[PDB]
Symmetry: D2
Subunit: 255 residues, 4 copies
Amino acid sequence: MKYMITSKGDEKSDLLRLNMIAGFGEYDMEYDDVEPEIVISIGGDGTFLSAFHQYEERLDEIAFIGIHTGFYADWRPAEADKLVKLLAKGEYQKVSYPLLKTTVKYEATYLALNESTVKSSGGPFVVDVVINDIHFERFRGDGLCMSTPSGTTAYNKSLGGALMHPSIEAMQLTEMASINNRVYRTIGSPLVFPKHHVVSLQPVNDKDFQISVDHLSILHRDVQEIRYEVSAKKIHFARFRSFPFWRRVHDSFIE
Amino acid sequence: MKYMITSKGDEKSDLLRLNMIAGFGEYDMEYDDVEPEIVISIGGDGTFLSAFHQYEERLDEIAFIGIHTGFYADWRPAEADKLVKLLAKGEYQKVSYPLLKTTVKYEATYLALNESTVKSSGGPFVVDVVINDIHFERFRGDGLCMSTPSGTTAYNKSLGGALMHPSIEAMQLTEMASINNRVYRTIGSPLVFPKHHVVSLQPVNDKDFQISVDHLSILHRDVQEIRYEVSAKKIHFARFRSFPFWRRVHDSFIE
Amino acid sequence: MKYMITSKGDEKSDLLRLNMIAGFGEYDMEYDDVEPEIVISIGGDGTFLSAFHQYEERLDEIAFIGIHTGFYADWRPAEADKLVKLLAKGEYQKVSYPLLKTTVKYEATYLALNESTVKSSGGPFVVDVVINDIHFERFRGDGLCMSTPSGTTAYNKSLGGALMHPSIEAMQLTEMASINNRVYRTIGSPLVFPKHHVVSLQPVNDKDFQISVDHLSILHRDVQEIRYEVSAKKIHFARFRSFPFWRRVHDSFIE
Amino acid sequence: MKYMITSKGDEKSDLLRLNMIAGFGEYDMEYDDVEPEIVISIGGDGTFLSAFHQYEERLDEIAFIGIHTGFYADWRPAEADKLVKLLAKGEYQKVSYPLLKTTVKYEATYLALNESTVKSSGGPFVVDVVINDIHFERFRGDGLCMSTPSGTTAYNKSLGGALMHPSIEAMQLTEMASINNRVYRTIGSPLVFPKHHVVSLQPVNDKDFQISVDHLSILHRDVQEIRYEVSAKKIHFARFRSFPFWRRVHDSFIE
Ligand SMILES: Nc1ncnc2c1ncn2[C@@H]1O[C@H](COP(=O)(O)OP(=O)(O)OC[C@H]2O[C@@H](n3cnc4c(N)ncnc43)[C@H](O)[C@@H]2O)[C@@H](O)[C@H]1O
Ligand SMILES: Nc1ncnc2c1ncn2[C@@H]1O[C@H](COP(=O)(O)OP(=O)(O)OC[C@H]2O[C@@H](n3cnc4c(N)ncnc43)[C@H](O)[C@@H]2O)[C@@H](O)[C@H]1O
Ligand SMILES: Nc1ncnc2c1ncn2[C@@H]1O[C@H](COP(=O)(O)OP(=O)(O)OC[C@H]2O[C@@H](n3cnc4c(N)ncnc43)[C@H](O)[C@@H]2O)[C@@H](O)[C@H]1O
Ligand SMILES: Nc1ncnc2c1ncn2[C@@H]1O[C@H](COP(=O)(O)OP(=O)(O)OC[C@H]2O[C@@H](n3cnc4c(N)ncnc43)[C@H](O)[C@@H]2O)[C@@H](O)[C@H]1O
């Protein structure tokens, strides 16, 4: 199979990458970073996010694996040799996670694996929240976060969001510091949306917004609409062993 | 069709019930509170919850309707005559919401439409939380709440839980006042579970618990396990017009 | 000086108590549990709370010390011999913390070192909150917690309350699961009150309440009013070394 | 007395200002915007904040009044004529609120009436929190907010902070979206500090920060320290009638 490996680019990670490549040499099994079927990320979750965004045009063709030197890792660096063999022998089943589609109209389209957020350029942030064409609330505050299920353990979590099992095809919207008084009113609760529901943000003033997709953060000017929906596209993971999401959550947050 | 009507038992509600019955007399269309196909609740959400729990053995056979004199209402009292006609002419499609199965072992089984909660008899509350047989956390605090999607606007909401669209077959667990220090540790985030996931609570001490299912609240003694899962059974609603969940949420919480 | 020692009543604690007594025998320095000037608590914070409530009629005359076998401890069990000597030689300055006065009218009066809470007998909990005779809010939910500054790290903390330095003569009110919708409305924010401010809770229905003061929890019947204020009385601590509150908070919650 | 009036600069406010000036003409009572003893703000709380920051070198000499066309207002526009007379006849007592001193070292010093916040230039935000020279926590997240007591109803409130009566000489620190896992740990609770306590923020990386003081927001480069403390300076308000803080809180947030 075609494969490539990204590295966090530090010493531990580069050396681990070279050893896996060498191990892969003993199978066939060729390195190709243009059209891989297997993408291996060595480093952290940021490294993994970058790997995802590198090959986002090829998501249907790729199975991703992460090594942590991690919610998208998965393998310790000492398990690397076992990973080469198992991966060479094709001894793996695939799991798929949902992604979030962001549409920015003035049309630009983005995929997130963790989340997309909106803040103002600075700037009070005021937007109208429209769910399935129905006007839901006028949001005043610092911003909004829209999360995939695997993204729920990330920024969403820090915002008081729920953690969702990634087999649920949904997206979750959280508030950042909303103003609520006798005048101004938001739901003040995370909102979880099914597939096919469309959350639309529309400017009240003030059409400039700092929009983030996972790590990428760009100021968009003269925005008419930001549109959120569960993507029809999914990321596919290779594995290999049972490592349940709730165990992964336990390992990262409890002990 | 067979039908019955429950009333909040105040003047407005009893009189509205008698008028609908009289209106129903002009169709056929017979009153039967043993095996109705249509159950009409007049009053509040508590009235509706009682109606549900009255006919919980017959959920596959019944379409419920609520009039509010409401998340399970739905119809204003002035719309009652239009409801009789529409209901008589069979001019309705059915919508289904998920329910939560609670199992209490010492085995007792309960269905909730809103939620089931666990507290101690008083009593520090300490339980071990086991997800799909994996030990997740030892919870110390006031108690736990497990919510259906339509229950998310209720007790769940007051506990910092997310609001979930009821087309998502899931249940959501929230904490009540958890102790967290350098010793004791909980996830401190709502958890959203798919169908087939099983959340199990097991006593650490101390096997007496005040367990609630919607409005019903009973002290269970010598408990070995409380077990939560998305029920295979669903409640069915009759309607009639578009009244979207997110609109319903807006109407109840925003304006 | 007159002194006494309470023990958690387990093996470690009883034995540590007997050794301190023996060490105290070498000074003068007599044991008296009727009118001590020094009260030593060995065990946990619960042991310390009990010690406080044992001698609450004598707070102006007593300096308390805690050994943890702890926010009210303070000394490790290995430091006990150094504590005997230092305490014998009178090598200590006193620090005072504020307390909360609870008044229950039908009049009963209680002092809390941590907090006093109000819930219903079960029972929806609904009370009118009156600050300095002004009607502030109608509270609907599970209950309310009123905390001293040293109590802020306890139950208050689990309820989303702020941690306050105990040199501030104040009390803090937190909500337990308040209902908020378009109908029902609470402040949904902890409230911090100065000395001389009076928070009054008054029944709406329904005059039975489960009222807690620190560990003690009793059902009060036919309540007309619960009244909260910063007590004129203060607890006095003996010490001995610098152990700053914020360090104590760090040690208990961070690392 | 010397006096001046600032206006929100819209029609209602400018016209109300001219009428008060004319009313003041009938007393003596001269307009002076260089050294006023009375500063009247007409508009909103932003107008009032600007008025405060205009005359921050003269706080000991000035009594501020706000008209709202408001937590710092206070007077409705229809009450303006009564305000002129009462203010002319000197029929007022003064109330003082605490302020927050911010020190930025590379030394720049700022006063806030609401709050000062710190975020990164963008930029992960990581700082070490040092209370009275003791290292308390390493904060990772979006930023931190330090609030005066009258500022607690503002940005602090939206961040889950407590509302404090402004007679309490204190400052309150809240978190913006902190990361907490098994690795990274913050207190995750607002912290309330007495007068003379010093909260120090120190860079970990990364010495550029967006620092806000009330409305003003500037990027500071090559920061070594941000230092917070209750200011020795206080704002003085003129009034006139009883309008208690808790009533003001009720009027703005409940009904
Ligand atoms: N799915 C998931 N679950 C749990 N933990 C995760 C996850 N993904 C990344 N992370 C962790 O987030 C932590 C901080 O993010 P980091 O600095 O790694 O960001 P990246 O460039 O990779 O990439 C930026 C990411 O950080 C997230 N982020 C950005 N700001 C915050 C704050 N303030 N709190 C929490 N998360 C944030 C942002 O959404 C992106 O997800 C880091 O320790 C990662 O291990
Ligand atoms: N699905 C849904 N969405 C939004 N609002 C709803 C819903 N169901 C009931 N309610 C409302 O809850 C409010 C309080 O409940 P109520 O006293 O009606 O309780 P019931 O006997 O019907 O029945 C007891 C119910 O109240 C819930 N409950 C109990 N205690 C609380 C607190 N403290 N906060 C919020 N909800 C609570 C409990 O779970 C049961 O759901 C009331 O105004 C209802 O209109
Ligand atoms: N001042 C202070 N700061 C930090 N930690 C403290 C403090 N005082 C006690 N504790 C700790 O609270 C923990 C639980 O309380 P525990 O069971 O010790 O209660 P006690 O009988 O002593 O006594 C009952 C106490 O527990 C508090 N309590 C009761 N329920 C809760 C919940 N659900 N969360 C947090 N605290 C609670 C209650 O207010 C009383 O303060 C325990 O680990 C203590 O070390
Ligand atoms: N003391 C107090 N209590 C209650 N409400 C108040 C107070 N002061 C201002 N406000 C209100 O804050 C609201 C938003 O602030 P606005 O846009 O007025 O800001 P300003 O330029 O005056 O000035 C900027 C101010 O807004 C605050 N602010 C900035 N962002 C937020 C968010 N996201 N939530 C809440 N407050 C914020 C910031 O700290 C400054 O205090 C506005 O409706 C004011 O009436």
